[PDB]
Amino acid sequence: PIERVDYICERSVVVPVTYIRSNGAPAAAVLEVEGKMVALQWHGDLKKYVAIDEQDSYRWADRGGQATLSHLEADHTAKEVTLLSACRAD
Amino acid sequence: PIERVDYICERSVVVPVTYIRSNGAPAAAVLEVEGKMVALQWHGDLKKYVAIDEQDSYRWADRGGQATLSHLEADHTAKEVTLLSACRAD
Amino acid sequence: EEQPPIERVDYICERSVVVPVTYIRSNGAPAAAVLEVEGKMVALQWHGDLKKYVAIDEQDSYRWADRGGQATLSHLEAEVTLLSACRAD
């Protein structure tokens, strides 16, 4: 139910991740990115994790061994920005 | 079920924590300490969290608003060392 | 004994990213900067002709420029702007 995975991304950036699963499904992920501890909740309909802090809305997708960090700024006019697109589990 | 709490400890050390609960009980905690991401599992009998990595066995107790970071070295002769004893939720 | 001026500055950037910086000056001129960015300690040397700091490691070539309190973090594999709205706190 708790798993530590390190990802190596573009520019050799290392993203440490903790995954928390519950009863056969993803539940939460905790990341350390951009100097922050980022807690995210699994959204099954979106097939990705979304930050619990709506004012600092990182998203994390780990799919088929490739993971992506993105972020949506708080203002409703903002568009989602991809921050790391070449992360792979070490 | 997912909560971010920052602790301020001795020497003004800041320990970021994510708590993960499941069905009314503690389940996991993720800490950033000593430059590491540390994932810990709740042990109800011990009333504390214990690192999932037996080779780097941090322990975390958050009790009555006071939290304590300790660590047990891998060798069986080691004794538990208290690393931070004056942590309080910010 | 020599005491090059050492200054800590924290920058707050877009997404409220905090970039801690130590500046080390020597005899009235910039000399070095140390940043914590993307989970890394990055040491940089001042390049006066370029008017910016360049990572000492050519294999991980961050650049850092501060002009009028606004700073930019960029990176060159072999230049991409990583943070463009850093402001001295």
Added chain:
Amino acid sequence: EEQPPIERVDYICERSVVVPVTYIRSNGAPAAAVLEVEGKMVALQWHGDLKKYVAIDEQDSYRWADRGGQATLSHLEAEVTLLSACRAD
């Protein structure tokens, strides 16, 4: 233009704690060190009489000494050893 030598050294300590260090030297002598410890960027000035580095912030007074490849991180509120088994990797 002046180029004080800049060196990155990583120390591996007890509990496998990694302390990243940047050393900045000036004209053949130690001058400054920048550490990342306990989640902080800590800038320190060399004190030749004490043969160690002392934090520039007196309110958070870390000290760092490296002698023969073995280093100690300590701290003085107003001295506690925090890491005593650091070794240059």
